[PDB]
Amino acid sequence: ALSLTADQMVSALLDAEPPILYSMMGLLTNLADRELVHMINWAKRVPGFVDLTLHDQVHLLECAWLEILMIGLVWRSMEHPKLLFAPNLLLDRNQGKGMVEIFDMLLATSSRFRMMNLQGEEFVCLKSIILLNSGVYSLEEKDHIHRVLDKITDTLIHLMAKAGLTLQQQHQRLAQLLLILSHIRHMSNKGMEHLYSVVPLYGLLLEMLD
Amino acid sequence: ALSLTADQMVSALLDAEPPILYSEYPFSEASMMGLLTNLADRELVHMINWAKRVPGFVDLTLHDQVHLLECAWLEILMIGLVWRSMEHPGKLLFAPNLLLDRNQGKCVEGMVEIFDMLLATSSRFRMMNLQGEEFVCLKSIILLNSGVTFSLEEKDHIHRVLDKITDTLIHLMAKAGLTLQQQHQRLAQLLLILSHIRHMSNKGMEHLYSLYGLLLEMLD
Ligand SMILES: CC/C(=C(\c1ccc(O)cc1)c1ccc(OCCN(C)C)cc1)c1ccccc1
Ligand SMILES: CC/C(=C(\c1ccc(O)cc1)c1ccc(OCCN(C)C)cc1)c1ccccc1
Questions:
Q1: Rounded to whole angstroms, how far apart are CA atoms B125 and A8?
Q2: Which domains does chain B show, CATH number per domain?
Q3: B96 DSSP 8-state letter
Q4: Are strands B99-101 and B91-93 parallel, antiparallel or unpaired?
Q5: Shortest Cα distance from A108 to chain B (angstroms)?
Q6: Which of B184, B190, B198, B209 would you mutate first to test chain A, the one with the most A CBs within 10 A?
Q7: Which atom of ligand 1 is nearest to the CA of A35?
Q8: Within its chain, how far is the Cα of B27 from the centroid?
Q9: What is each CA distance from A192 to B191, B199, B205, in whole angstroms?
Q10: How far apart are CA B78 and CA B139, in angstroms?
């Protein structure tokens, strides 16, 4: 549950991973939408999430879905200085031409991950963080959510330790990772805003959440 | 000033805080935005001078000083608001003479939701017994991290200062009796409350839509 050990955590999280998908606003809309159905399923497989209410499971996915899509998108693009929406569709920044500076922001985060040589294990933890931490703001599990988040913080450190960083680089990397989550909230917001020139609604979320 | 001990780094930052401002005022209407605009802009002038007092910040080039500040100001004001509101459950302390309960924010369409969010964050800081040293750390962390979407071997610099704060932030926690885990854990918690604040800051902007020249010359 949370009495998972940090290796059991990473084990779970890598196994939770949604498949790889293949295929203009229509392109990316249809694409997001599709990925959005798998995301619902991964959320379920995330340790600690299945513990919350439906009403709360749903709130959380309500609040995080777009950054979960972006940080994903940012991830698979690390190795293509180019956004690789799916193996078969891979756009450059010129191609963004009112969506250009969202792309610019994304390609920033993408290089910053390449620079940081981010790990699939580290990545995978960041995503669970975004799921739980996003909407965490009358007897409560916010307490619970907070516990699961601390588990993951420990899981993150634990990975860095295993990999043989010094205790100082551990707190340091953890920082520059959790800070990129800020950048990502932002691009997500700029995203939401531009999809008023939208949010997967409740009942549907809730019925698939089961 | 890259190398200077955690102790130094804290007092530097603690000793550079803008003054405490007072507001001016015939009971509230949507003339309250004007009221809050005003407070914003005065505060924003002093924030320029605090940016300059933050170690490493003047080392950056003028345009980057501006990029950073342009990108992080409302986020920097909100965290300040939040911070000073911590000792006053249920109300936002705009100025020492302008405590405002959430009810009052409902007198400007779309603001109550921001207010709610702020009061939540203010809660969370109190419940964490966030110390002033840690707050000062996070303010500077917002200045630095928010803009860091830009030769640019200046990013590298920004980053190393940022690590330097991290150290300083850890260092305090260490010195308050905190076991190693509890350190890594609280550090997470604070940096993760930084996301919450950008969110608020963006929400702020949108309902402030529905500047450069000034900051450049003002930053000399
Ligand atoms: C930047 C990529 C993107 C989308 C996207 C991101 C990652 C990914 O893996 C796939 C797509 C995007 C576009 C539309 C969108 O809304 C769909 C509405 N559905 C939920 C009914 C979501 C993401 C987008 C978002 C806002 C504006 C312009 C583009
Ligand atoms: C929530 C507080 C707030 C402002 C504020 C926050 C903290 C603080 O210490 C002082 C004020 C606020 C209001 C207006 C504003 O605009 C300034 C425009 N200038 C920069 C051109 C900035 C902040 C606000 C922001 C957006 C919409 C409604 C209210």
A1: 31
A2: 1-220 (1.10.565.10)
A3: T
A4: antiparallel
A5: 6
A6: B184
A7: 9
A8: 29
A9: 23, 12, 13
A10: 10
Rounded distance between C-alpha atoms, residue B98 and residue B96, angstroms = 6
**Cβ pair B195:A189 closer than 8 A:** no
Closest CA to B34 of B26, B22, B20, B24: B24
Phi, psi of A83 (to 5 degrees): -90, 125
**Residues in the annotated binding site of A for 17beta-estradiol:** 35, 76, 194
Residue A43 tokens read as 């959320």
**CA nearest to B197 within chain A:** A182
Q: Which residues pair with B93 in a beta bridge?
A: B99
Residue B84 counted as an annotated binding residue = yes
Residue A52 DSSP symbol: S
Q: Quick one: residue B93, left, alpha or beta (phi over 0 = left, psi -120 to 50 = alpha)? A: beta
Give the position of tokens 């900051």: B215
On whether the CB atoms of residues A11 and A121 are closer than 8 A, the answer is no
Kindly provide the resolution of this structure in angstroms, with one decimal. 3.1
- Which atom from ligand 1 is nearest to the alpha carbon of A106? 1
End-to-end CA distance of chain A: 20
Q: What was the experiment behind these coordinates?
A: X-ray
Of the residues B36, B47, B71, which should be mutated to test ligand 2's pocket, given the most ligand atoms within 8 Å of the CB? Answer: B36
